[PDB]
Design an enzyme around this catalytic site. Structure first.
Site, PDB file in Angstrom:
ATOM      1  CG  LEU A  43    -125.115  38.971 -73.082  1.00 46.74           C
ATOM      2  CD1 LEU A  43    -124.085  38.136 -72.312  1.00 46.74           C
ATOM      3  CD2 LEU A  43    -126.459  38.318 -73.185  1.00 46.74           C
ATOM      4  CG  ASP A  44    -119.292  41.710 -74.265  1.00 48.71           C
ATOM      5  OD1 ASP A  44    -118.307  40.969 -74.047  1.00 48.71           O
ATOM      6  OD2 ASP A  44    -119.510  42.777 -73.618  1.00 48.71           O
ATOM      7  NE  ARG A  45    -120.984  44.645 -81.866  1.00 44.71           N
ATOM      8  CZ  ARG A  45    -120.329  43.826 -82.670  1.00 44.71           C
ATOM      9  NH1 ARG A  45    -120.951  43.068 -83.584  1.00 44.71           N
ATOM     10  NH2 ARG A  45    -119.006  43.799 -82.587  1.00 44.71           N
ATOM     11  CG  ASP A  46    -118.787  39.407 -79.502  1.00 46.05           C
ATOM     12  OD1 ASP A  46    -119.041  39.862 -78.364  1.00 46.05           O
ATOM     13  OD2 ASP A  46    -117.624  39.185 -79.897  1.00 46.05           O
ATOM     14  CB  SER A  47    -122.388  37.475 -75.476  1.00 43.25           C
ATOM     15  OG  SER A  47    -121.007  37.493 -75.234  1.00 43.25           O
TER      16      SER A  47
END
Length: 181
Positions: A43-47
């Site tokens: 899961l992306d850093r900014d998610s």
């Protein structure tokens, strides 16, 4: 052999979905004092939101193997108020630089009652924002962000609520729980 470990985590914003040190970045070591587990679906850093961590190859494959059509439910805060036509396009398919998207779920929803503050908060006074519930069965690069921007409604905040069998039910941001049998 290796006893199975499965952990669900509600990942904060600006945290990497990994345990390995990465210079200048925050990792799961600050939140989950367990070694030997890794993301079954990064899961992306900014998610924000649901991350499944395991040491078990069968579970990893079940959740991540390209083409498995693992369902994911996201709550997405977007700029503007998506039109019915835009939502129909998200449901049916759009063509990104990497090809058409599979059919998806997409619905305008109320701001979720369970929402936590982001630190830092989202990116304007004169422009409304809306929430979408988007259900995807693919895992391409930044897919939700690319899809919403494509149809004219850029993503401001992205929360993964569910993936495969699992959800964020009763998991505060930054909290984890063990899944056992």
């Amino acid at each position: 052999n290796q006893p199975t470990r499965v952990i669900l985590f509600n990942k904060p914003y600006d945290v990497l979905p990994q345990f390995t040190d990465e210079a200048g970045r925050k990792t799961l070591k600050e939140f989950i004092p367990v070694q030997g587990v890794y993301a079954a679906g990064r899961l992306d850093r900014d998610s924000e939101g649901l991350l499944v961590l395991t040491n078990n190859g069968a579970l990893q494959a079940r959740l991540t193997q390209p083409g498995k059509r693992t369902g994911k439910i996201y709550y997405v805060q977007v700029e503007g108020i998506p039109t019915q036509d835009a939502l129909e396009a998200l449901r049916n398919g759009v063509t990104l630089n990497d090809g058409p998207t599979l059919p998806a779920g997409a619905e305008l929803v109320d701001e979720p009652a369970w929402l936590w503050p982001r630190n830092p908060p989202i990116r304007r006074k004169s422009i409304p924002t809306s929430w979408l519930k988007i259900t995807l069965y693919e895992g391409r690069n930044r897919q939700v962000r690319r899809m919403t921007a494509h149809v004219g409604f850029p993503t401001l905040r992205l929360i993964r609520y569910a993936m495969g069998d699992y959800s964020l039910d009763n998991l505060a941001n930054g909290e984890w729980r063990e899944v056992t049998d």
